[PDB]
Design a protein around this nucleic acid. Sequence first.
RNA 1: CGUAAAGCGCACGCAGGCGGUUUGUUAAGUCAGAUGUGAAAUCCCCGGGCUCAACCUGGGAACUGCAUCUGAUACUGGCAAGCUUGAGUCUCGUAGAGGGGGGUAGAAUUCCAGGUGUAGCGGUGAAAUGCGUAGAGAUCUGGAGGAAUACCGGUGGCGAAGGCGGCCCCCUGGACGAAGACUGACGCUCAGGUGCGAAAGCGUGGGGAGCAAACAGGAUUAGAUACCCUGGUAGUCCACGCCGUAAACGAUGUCGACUUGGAGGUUGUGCCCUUGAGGCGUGGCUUCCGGAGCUAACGCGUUAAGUCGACCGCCUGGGGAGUA
Lengths: 218, 129, 88
Amino acid sequence: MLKAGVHFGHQTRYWNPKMKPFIFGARNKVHIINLEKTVPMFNEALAELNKIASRKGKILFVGTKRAASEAVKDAALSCDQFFVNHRWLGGMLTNWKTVRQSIKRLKDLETQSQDGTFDKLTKKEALMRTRELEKLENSLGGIKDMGGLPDALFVIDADHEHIAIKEANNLGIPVFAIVDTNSDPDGVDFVIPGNDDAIRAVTLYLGAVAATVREGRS
Amino acid sequence: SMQDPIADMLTRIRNGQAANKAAVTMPSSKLKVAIANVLKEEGFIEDFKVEGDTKPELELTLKYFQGKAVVESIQRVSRPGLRIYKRKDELPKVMAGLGIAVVSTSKGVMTDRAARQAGLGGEIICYVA
Amino acid sequence: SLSTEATAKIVSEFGRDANDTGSTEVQVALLTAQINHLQGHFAEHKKDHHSRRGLLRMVSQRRKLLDYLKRKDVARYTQLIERLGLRR
RNA sequence: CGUAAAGCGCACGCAGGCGGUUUGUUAAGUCAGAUGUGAAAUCCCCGGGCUCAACCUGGGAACUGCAUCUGAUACUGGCAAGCUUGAGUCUCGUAGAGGGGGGUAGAAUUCCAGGUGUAGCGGUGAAAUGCGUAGAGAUCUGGAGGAAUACCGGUGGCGAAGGCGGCCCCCUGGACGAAGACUGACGCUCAGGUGCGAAAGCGUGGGGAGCAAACAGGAUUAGAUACCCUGGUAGUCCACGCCGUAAACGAUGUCGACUUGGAGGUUGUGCCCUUGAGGCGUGGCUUCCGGAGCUAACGCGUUAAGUCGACCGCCUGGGGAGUA
């Protein structure tokens, strides 16, 4: 389509030979991503995400890149989506049993956050309180609505979120990930290509994965 | 120098299946075409083809049932430094029959099981598994 | 190094067909001429071990070529050594 | 067999081991069948007998071996004819401290003679031995002799290794490249054998400026046969002979093939816009990082310690001991 394939590859050195089945190579040694290999894995990926949304499972899309996470955290949340935006804490899925203590801490600090106990002792408890609330909200975000153990897991960049796909591989969660030339496609269950840094590409891919997943089956 | 082109053939096959090459191109010979016929009949490769009349070039199209390769192991048994000639009651079974042993017998080059059905011995070219 | 005109003369002398610079008689005659010239060189220049290694390489190449020609055709080998003057 | 024990310091090669590809053949190996034989006893498998078992015994099996007869080349080996794709040769060029001989040049050190000039120079953590009151050191002029070539100089280049650095000439070895031609397996490795082989050392004849084992003096120290200083002989230099060892190392033998990549260096070449030390390919040699894989790990990683093939060398606990 005209929406995909416009995004071009960057970082013309330190690419991957596993990626090399997906590069044109035109425009004087700049690694251009091939549209005809980008599109069918994308169509099958959205077919399987429709299958996951038919189960009413957790999607858990992650993006922590600079100048795109602010779009990730708000644009793709229609009604019930689950996001990670910034400061991706390592090992969240593997030891979510002891991250459950921190998320109960986030729930307790969100409860009565605007009245009562945090308003008493007006400033000296409260500056540390507000800093703790904002750092825990930044650390977790949509995990409070996610509630643990997602069915699928979506990744906006395999190289930046190589830890996330590693523990998703450990927990057996299917991975739907957009990769670049420098990133590794071996550990990804459903690999789709594209440009990770591009604001246009991340917005159109987020709109595409938000499309027809809002309803699932019914 | 090159002394065992058959070992070079199996070496190229093993390196291709390790490096996930789709096809292996190399110089050919009559023995190479016979071993390619045995491997194609037993299903360890997909296809083999000879190109050219001046320099005959052999292409083997390697196959993969999974992400892993089809051939689990490939080893040269009879060597130029040591040739192994075994009789009809002494030629072995690889993997208790799940693999094959390519053996050059008096009527042709075929599977060890085919040689045992034909009642012939010979030298084992290789073990395929 | 043996001169271009000298190599052309030896190729024309030892080639019964024109442009036979690769034949065993032509190679052995070229090596023999260079060996005689280097014997004249090394008599004045002893202790030139680095050039004598190339001399011994040429001697070994000439001996292996003569062994191959003796295995292939003994009449050509005898004719070549009786027109060159070696292997007594 | 990099680091635990283990790759000869390197190379050339005889015997030996192995050997690209196509077509004809007794078949030598090899394969298949049959025959003669492989004594009996003893292990093995079905039975009997001793009340059972050990023990005895019937038949078969086995003795994997060696000879004789019959078959095609599937492979190896021989003969015959081939092919070029391994190896090599020629044409034209390119880079390079590759080697041997000779000549020359410029800084600098030392010494001798001389001019100016005075009381210190040199050395060290401090001093002192030493040089200088017969004039040192310092500065300048002229002359003599020997050795090594600042800059260029580089994670550069060449050579099998050791190794090779000013410039010029003569003789000469090797490597690489576009293109074309030629011979047609002429190839790889190689125990013995032969050659090369740092520095130190040895013999003869020279040379000897610096440096410097030994030696002497002065320091240091509890002592100092040392580290330090002041001198200083062999030696370091040349010619011809020995010696044949090194942490001779990449602690990784040679040849051949295959296997993801990136960043440079050096050296050839094809195309593009002849307009530039600009762009796209193809070769060789190299430096660093790194994927799979391997490894005990460190790490190696297309120049492998990855996947194989050919051949050679070496190891079998430490010390004694690479000693008698």
